[PDB]
Amino acid sequence: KFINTMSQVPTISQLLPLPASDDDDLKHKSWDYLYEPDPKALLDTLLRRYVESQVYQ
Amino acid sequence: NLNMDLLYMAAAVMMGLAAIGAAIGIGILGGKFLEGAARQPDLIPLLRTQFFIVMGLVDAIPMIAVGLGLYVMFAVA
């Protein structure tokens, strides 16, 4: 993990099962999505892409 | 004479059909209004505005029908 030009630290971190990120939606009483075609097929791809993205990071 | 018994039934048929048409034609519209609301409540006031604006149109022919039904059943008897 690159903190500073003068210090770097090794870290082992979890990425499955998904860690909790303090993503509380209490402001989002206001709405829900229109899903095309269905939310489960979307959620699958979202999770896969997210894991790939964090490996790249 | 048998005028009045048939006159009674004529209003009954026209107004029964009016009732079915208006009930269903408004039920559909209200169902779509509710499923539009539930996805984002914050648009409730605008969509309720639109709902009345439109439903006043669906209730055009059934109102004519009820008017004629009452006229026949009472004025003409």
Q: In whole angstroms, give the CA distance from residue B12 to residue B14.
A: 6
Q: In whole angstroms, give the CA distance from residue A44 to residue A52.
A: 13
Q: Which residues on A lie below 8 Å from B41 (Cβ)?
A: 29-31
Scanning the structure block, which residue is given the tokens 């107004």?
Answer: B15
Contact A44, B54 (CB under 8 A): no
Question: In which domain, by residue range, is B48 found?
Answer: 1-77
Interface test with B, best of A25, A27, A31 (most B CBs within 10 A): A31
Contact A15, A51 (CB under 8 A): yes
Tell me the angle at which helices B3-39 and B61-70 cross, rounded to the nearest 10 degrees: 150
Interface contact A36, partner B, CB < 8 A: no
Scanning the structure block, which residue is given the tokens 């026209």?
Answer: B14
Amino acid at B29: L
A32/chain B closest Cα distance in angstroms:
5
Contact B21, B14 (CB under 8 A): no
Q: List the determination method.
A: cryo-EM
Q: In whole angstroms, give the CA distance from residue A47 to residue A35.
A: 16
CA A48, distance to chain mean position in Å, is: 10
Count CA within 13 A, CB hemisphere, residue A20. Answer: 2
Q: Which residues on B lie below 8 Å from A34 (Cβ)?
A: 39
Return the number of other C-beta atoms located less than 10 Å from residue B51's C-beta: 19
What's B26's domain CATH number?
1.20.20.10
Contact A29, B44 (CB under 8 A): no
Instruction: Provide the domain count of chain B.
Output: 1
Interface contact A29, partner B, CB < 8 A: yes
Tokens of B6: 């048939």
Residues 6+ apart with CB under 8 A from B39: A31, A32, A34
B40–A34 CB contact, under 8 Å: no
